[PDB]
Amino acid sequence: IQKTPQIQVYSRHPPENGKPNILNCYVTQFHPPHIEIQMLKNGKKIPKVEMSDMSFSKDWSFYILAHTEFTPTETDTYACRVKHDSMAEPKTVYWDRDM
């Protein structure tokens, strides 16, 4: 079964430039489980990234969470880039702090 991943990027608390926070990238509803997830700050890969909350729903599709700590600024941009065999090219989703 081949299902295309849904990428959701959000923070733990409402953004406040200068206060520490947690940035999350939730990748859901995909199959096969082969997947590459990357988090970026200004185009560079963030090294300290934790993977957790792995599971699967009733229809057996996979769920996985990627997260890292971060202190927002008004000039830094964040994004989550995902590679999965259901897509021709890697998908990048930028964090929308005004959502």
Binding site: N24, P32, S52, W60
Partner: protein, 274 residues
């Protein structure tokens, strides 16, 4: 309230890249507490919740020996299934399993379950009676027959009814401060303009626990369930969850809509307006 102990097992073959990847993830309610990954530098069952530090070294040694055993068992399964389905040794294939038990407030057993899937499709599952099996296809029928003659349901039932139940009660006790807490949501609404004099009102519910919560939008007292966008509740990285629900409304008619938040950590529901 009800509480559950669940284990999500996944075995994925990867021809030409060596042995299959094998993972086991354990959960007590909506909380990840243990994990095992065969691709790890040093594969061992490791704790994922601070309260698990109360378990001695013999616990981790037992769980690790067990997992390595499960890993070999599943490598065989990946070979067998290729036979059952007349498939080639060149493709990647996946087996998934969920096993668990749920208890009520008094700690008595509510139910137990174990389900298998191959390549994202139902394969075989234990029935509610915890005595018989049900197969999704011809191949699963072969396994059903093997398992009936070997008497597997009786061994499994002993686990779901006893071991699973007793250990679940222990986890809730040792980790009650974490597992029996209640974090109340903090909500707010955002406004976004659209073409044709309309707007998108979004209601956010943040940092709550447990994960169960109800977010609704209302107009004239009627809960606008049909015309409302919503996301599945999701973990926020620190053990809590978040969720949002939006509604597009006529420009200047915003105040006529309200957001209601129901959660076990709220004596009275929250009602928001932009």
């Amino acid at each position: 309230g009800p509480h559950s102990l669940r284990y999500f097992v996944t075995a994925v073959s990867r021809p030409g890249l060596g042995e299959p990847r094998y993972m086991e993830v354990g959960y007590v309610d909506d909380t990840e507490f243990v994990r095992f990954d065969s691709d790890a530098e040093n594969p061992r069952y490791e704790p994922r919740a601070r309260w698990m530090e109360q378990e001695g070294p013999e616990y981790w040694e037992r769980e690790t020996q067990k997992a390595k055993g499960n890993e070999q068992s599943f490598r065989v399964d990946l070979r067998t299934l290729l036979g059952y389905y007349n498939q080639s040794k060149g493709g990647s294939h996946t087996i998934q399993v969920i096993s668990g038990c749920e208890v009520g407030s008094d700690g008595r057993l509510l139910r137990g379950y174990q389900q298998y899937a191959y390549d994202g499709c139902d394969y075989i599952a234990l029935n509610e009676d915890l005595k018989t099996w049900t197969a999704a296809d011809m191949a699963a029928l072969i396994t059903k027959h093997k398992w009936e003659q070997a008497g597997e349901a009786e061994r499994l039932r002993a686990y779901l009814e006893g071991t699973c139940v007793e250990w679940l009660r222990r986890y809730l006790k040792n980790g009650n401060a974490t597992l029996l807490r209640t974090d109340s949501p903090k909500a707010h609404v955002t406004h976004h303009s659209r073409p044709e004099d309309k707007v998108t009102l979004r209601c956010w519910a943040l940092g709550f626990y447990p994960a169960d919560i109800t977010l609704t939008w209302q107009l004239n007292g009627e809960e606008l369930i049909q015309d409302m966008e919503l996301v599945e509740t999701r973990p926020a990285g620190d053990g809590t969850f978040q969720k949002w629900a939006s509604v597009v409304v006529p420009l200047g008619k915003e105040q006529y809509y309200t957001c209601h938040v129901y959660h076990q950590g709220l004596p009275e529901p929250l009602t928001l307006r932009w």
